[PDB]
């Protein structure tokens, strides 16, 4: 369904240290209190950028598939975690039209109780994936909170993407260009954020 998004959707846009200062910048973001798509998984458009979150306690998600055709017909991104290793692929696989699990060749890479959040975007053929884990005690509603997302993996895939799906409750939503004001704590972590277009009061805050 549709639920209030609260203040989630915060991530580090740079690998540079700042402390005890306010910084305002414009980037792709998740609007505050927005209506995220909630589900208790058909193909959905990628559009500009994707945000996903899931109440994880049982390894519901088996992975993700990205691409244009959303099939092994062309080079499609595939994510799998098995045994004790994470596998990512961008090959045009010999797989079926739609691999499912119950309750040309190119580069490859080898590496509820909780809430796990992720953000996916592509810039100039380099695909950034950001993630964050936290403990929770809720399964269907959204517990109001505040936490950030750090980068883990970027690779120069160089592949256009339009369609995607997740291989398996969860929430999926979209990022658009908005401006934020962020506060860095003394230790250097992000702890407070302000959205420009929420109300005129926030516009005053930013100005």
């Amino acid at each position: 369904a549709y639920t209030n998004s609260f203040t989630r959707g915060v991530y580090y846009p740079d690998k540079v240290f700042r402390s005890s200062v306010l910084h305002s910048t414009q980037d792709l973001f998740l609007p505050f209190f927005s209506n995220v798509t909630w589900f208790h998984n058909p193909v959905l458009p990628f559009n500009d950028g994707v945000y996903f979150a899931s109440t994880e306690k049982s390894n519901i998600i088996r992975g993700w598939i990205f691409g244009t055709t959303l099939d092994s017909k062309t080079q499609s991104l595939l994510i799998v975690n098995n045994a004790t290793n994470v596998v990512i692929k961008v090959c045009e696989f010999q797989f079926c039209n739609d691999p499912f699990l119950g309750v040309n060749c190119t580069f490859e890479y080898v590496s509820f109780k909780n809430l796990r959040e992720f953000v996916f975007k592509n810039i100039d053929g380099y695909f950034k994936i950001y993630s964050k884990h936290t403990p929770i005690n809720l399964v269907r509603d959204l517990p109001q909170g505040f936490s950030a997302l750090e980068p883990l993996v970027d690779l120069p895939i160089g592949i256009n993407i339009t369609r995607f799906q997740t291989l398996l409750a969860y929430y999926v939503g979209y990022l658009q260009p908005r401006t934020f004001l962020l506060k860095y704590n003394e230790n250097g972590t992000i702890t407070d954020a302000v959205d420009c277009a929420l109300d005129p009061l926030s516009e005053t805050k930013c100005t």
Binding site: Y12, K15, V16, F17, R18, V21, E150, P151, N187, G188
Partner: protein
């Protein structure tokens, strides 16, 4: 000052700036090298009729050091210097393997034709690459004749078996000839050793700067690699290999202050450096900087020439320029009590002189010919801005009016003479 002689005072001419001692380059731990043993270091290079054209990408191709060695049978560069891409990330690569007889390999080349091109190793006319070859006739040569060599679509590797053999002629002697076709091939870069506590130019990863490098006490997060001072200045860094947090001190600099009395009196001079210590460039220390060419004195007088923080200097007697703390003036106590009063007995008259400016010199500018210089073409091109000229004149003219007004209202307070 555009004068042979100068009145007494202080002036500014240029700015002192320290110079960095040396340059430093730093880059991360190089790894993920290319499998160079695929073609030119493998067990046996692919024969011409079954030449391999598999692409190679996402690797560190550091073969330029090996390309600099003529030990190979041939190292023909087809447009790229050996060091042209030794520290650059190439778009892609193709590990071609088309070993063929030395004389027969002439037709098996990009843009070539003959019994070896169409049959075995057809290639694009202007395919990027460089020819590399090794002495395959020693052991890689087929004793019973190189039937799989070149004999009679680009990159599709009329048709016959070749007679190349190790015991054959020089021309028929085969070599491991292959046209290595050119962000995938990560050419490794160089780096230098780290130096601290010295004014140095530094290059950390892609960023470059200059200053003093010190072991900082900051606590950068694992994903953090740079530090921004609020004036958007990269001031704190992390070494890519020797993992530590370092900070950068700006290159020391200051103003060149010259203190001198009138040249007509003497030629002795003194020099002040602003906001630097002694070590940087008779020497004395003040809160305003480092002084040379003066003598400090424990005496005190009224101020002659300001320098700063109450420190002033003057030229006096056996004469030199001396620096001292300015005294606020003579002091005298006052004998107050609840039953005493001091009364004057005499008086005098003093005449004092005061001076006040009244007005300037009325100045006007006819900017038309000042800009154009009587040239018609410039006058024509002037029209595209227009009002500027007009506006300027009006402003200037306005000032002139107030000039006269001031003078008038200064002296016209009388109505009859």
């Amino acid at each position: 000052l555009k004068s042979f002689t100068v009145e007494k005072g202080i002036y500014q001419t240029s700015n002192f700036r320290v110079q960095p001692t040396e340059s430093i380059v730093r880059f991360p731990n190089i790894t993920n090298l290319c499998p160079f043993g695929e073609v030119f270091n493998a067990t046996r290079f692919a024969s011409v009729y079954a030449w391999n054209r598999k692409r190679i990408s996402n690797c560190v191709a550091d073969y330029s050091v090996l390309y600099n060695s003529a030990s190979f049978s041939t190292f023909k560069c087809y447009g790229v210097s050996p060091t042209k891409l030794n520290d650059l990330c190439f778009t892609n690569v193709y590990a071609d393997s088309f070993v063929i007889r030395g004389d027969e390999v002439r037709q098996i080349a990009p843009g070539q034709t003959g019994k070896i091109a169409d049959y075995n190793y057809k290639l694009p006319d202007d395919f990027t690459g460089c020819v590399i070859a090794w002495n395959s006739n020693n052991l890689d040569s087929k004793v019973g004749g190189n039937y799989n060599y070149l004999y009679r679509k680009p990159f599709e590797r009329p048709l016959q078996s070749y007679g190349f053999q190790p015991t054959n002629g020089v021309g028929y002697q085969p070599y491991r000839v292959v046209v290595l076709s050119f962000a995938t091939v990560c050419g490794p870069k160089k780096s230098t050793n780290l130096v601290k506590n010295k004014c140095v130019n530094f290059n950390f990863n892609g960023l470059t700067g200059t200053g003093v490098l010190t072991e900082s006490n900051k606590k950068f997060l694992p994903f953090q690699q740079f530090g921004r001072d609020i004036a958007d200045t990269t001031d704190a860094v992390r070494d890519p290999q020797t993992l530590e947090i370092l900070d950068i001190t700006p290159c020391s600099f200051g103003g060149v202050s010259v203190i001198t009395p009138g040249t007509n009196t003497s030629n002795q001079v003194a020099v002040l450096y602003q906001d630097v210590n002694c070590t940087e460039v008779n020497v004395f220390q003040t809160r305003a900087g480092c002084l040379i060419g003066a003598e400090h004195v424990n005496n005190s007088y009224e101020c002659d020439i300001p320098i700063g923080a109450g420190i002033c200097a003057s030229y006096q007697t056996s004469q030199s320029i001396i620096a001292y703390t300015m005294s606020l003036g003579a002091e005298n106590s006052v004998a107050y009590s609840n039953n005493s009063i001091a009364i004057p007995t005499n008086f005098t008259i003093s005449v004092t002189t005061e001076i006040l400016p009244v007005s300037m010199t009325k100045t006007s500018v006819d900017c038309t010919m000042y800009i154009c210089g009587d040239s018609t073409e410039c006058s024509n091109l002037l029209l595209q801005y227009g009002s500027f000229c007009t506006q300027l004149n009006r402003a200037l003219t306005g000032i002139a009016v107030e000039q006269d007004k001031n003078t008038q209202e200064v002296f016209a307070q009388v109505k009859q003479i």
